[PDB]
Amino acid sequence: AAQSVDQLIKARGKVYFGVATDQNRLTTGKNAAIIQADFGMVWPENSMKWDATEPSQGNFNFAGADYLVNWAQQNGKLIGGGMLVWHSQLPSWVSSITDKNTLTNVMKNHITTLMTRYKGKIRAWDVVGEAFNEDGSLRQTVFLNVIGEDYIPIAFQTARAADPNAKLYIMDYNLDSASYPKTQAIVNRVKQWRAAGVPIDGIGSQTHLSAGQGAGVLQALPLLASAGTPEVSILMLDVAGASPTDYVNVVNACLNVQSCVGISVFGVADPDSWRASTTPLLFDGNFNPKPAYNAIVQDLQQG
Amino acid sequence: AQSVDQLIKARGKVYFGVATDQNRLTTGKNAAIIQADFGMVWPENSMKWDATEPSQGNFNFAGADYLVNWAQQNGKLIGGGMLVWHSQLPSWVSSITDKNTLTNVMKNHITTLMTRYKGKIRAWDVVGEAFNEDGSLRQTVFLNVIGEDYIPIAFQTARAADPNAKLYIMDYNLDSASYPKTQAIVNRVKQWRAAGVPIDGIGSQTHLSAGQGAGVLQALPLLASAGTPEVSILMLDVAGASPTDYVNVVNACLNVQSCVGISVFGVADPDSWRASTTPLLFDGNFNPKPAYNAIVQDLQ
């Protein structure tokens, strides 16, 4: 009884506990069974990234994304998408563009095409990811360099037009400490963009922790919430060593922040992690729930 | 771990290979183990029809391109497939009822895939899983609509597109010499080749339950009696992964002159299509399992 973290988190008033996946996870291991039972939202591990979806200008690849969207619909799961504008996994045809009008239109087309395809089916998009340097200045990607800092407002405005139903998020990593310049900076810039009417509905904190860093998220998450977005989230969570303590502290940070809609982990089982040697996830290599999973369950159960 | 690929090459074979794809290469320890221990890679999913031509004339090559490029960069041989198969088949194909229309759809798919990687692919599986367990031909959309001759056409079309690729009809349940399916594919391939159909190979999609490794020692020589220049063991996995089934498996290949190699159907057990049986050669912690160490000792 009372072993789904998603079901338990919803009972506490949150939207979901989610997980990244894709077609070949769904067809292998025990991923599909675990997601069916335990998780309420799925995100494309890779199939919606720019290198996967638009490998040459205007030529899109949607087989993988479609597979995930369909599976999520068939299994009654919410679906997230992203990242629409991101410097990593970004084809060389984009990064070679030097003309402002041409990159603006290429960016807008990428956004619009993905969001239109899935219009009305996607809870939330990560519209812009990893836009910040560690010092809090904006990262000098092709977007910044060629379009300028208006590429962020343009990306969100384009997204809202493409699918007004989706929650639109900015996401970044190393927003885990409240004193860190990057944390402070994304709040200040998101406040300013929202004051200019940019439709930033959420800040997503891509939470990749080392052992003992869970505690600090209890202060960093409320600070992100202070930017005034309707939502914030913990995304792509993983924790080197998968201490119960670190995991429960992240969880509780979300519970404590009224605008935090949920938490997503960056895969199901350790061996399928990008950092497997750190065993950073909630299920082991035999697909058994780990102590951290059980400690989340106890944390979320109610009297 | 000592490399089963290098050891099998030392025994005169071409390769010991493995199925993989982009997201395996960027997670777990898969890239490192493939680099060290395997000499050929196959696309787990990225060259299947559903992945590559999800609507008519709309091709998706990013995933396949990634694999091909990784293989080149790391000095690995590459295989492709499956070009004609009833599983992971878009409904736009299976809904076709006209003979010419489907013949042309089948040809265009084959040609477009094989032409993009021309010269890079050691071997294609042109046809897979074409047989019923009783040895008759599986009543797929291609047999129902185009007829028997779909198999000859598929092989023929494959040769024109890349004359340097080894062409392999493939099937499963070819694991026992006494099984009707095994004798059946041998007879048909003999006749197709007599008529000049360019079938260079038969591959044995070898999905075994416990204890079935022993029978491969007679089934593979029977497959090789069809007279193809090559045969292979493909997509190998064995429920329970005991050393007996797999060594016994390593040795069927070694005993059959025309067998070019063996490929396993993934690296580590949790990434198997069947994982609770812990049936591959590396465990959920990416350790080499007793069956990997037994293969190494057998090949030394």
Ligand SMILES: O=[N+]([O-])c1ccc2[nH]nnc2c1
């Ligand atoms: O929470 N996630 O693990 C996760 C994974 C991939 C994504 N792409 N866009 N948002 C994403 C979220």
Ligand SMILES: O=[N+]([O-])c1ccc2[nH]nnc2c1
């Ligand atoms: O040996 N293989 O594991 C393997 C995997 C996928 C394939 N597709 N076509 N032939 C294939 C062989």
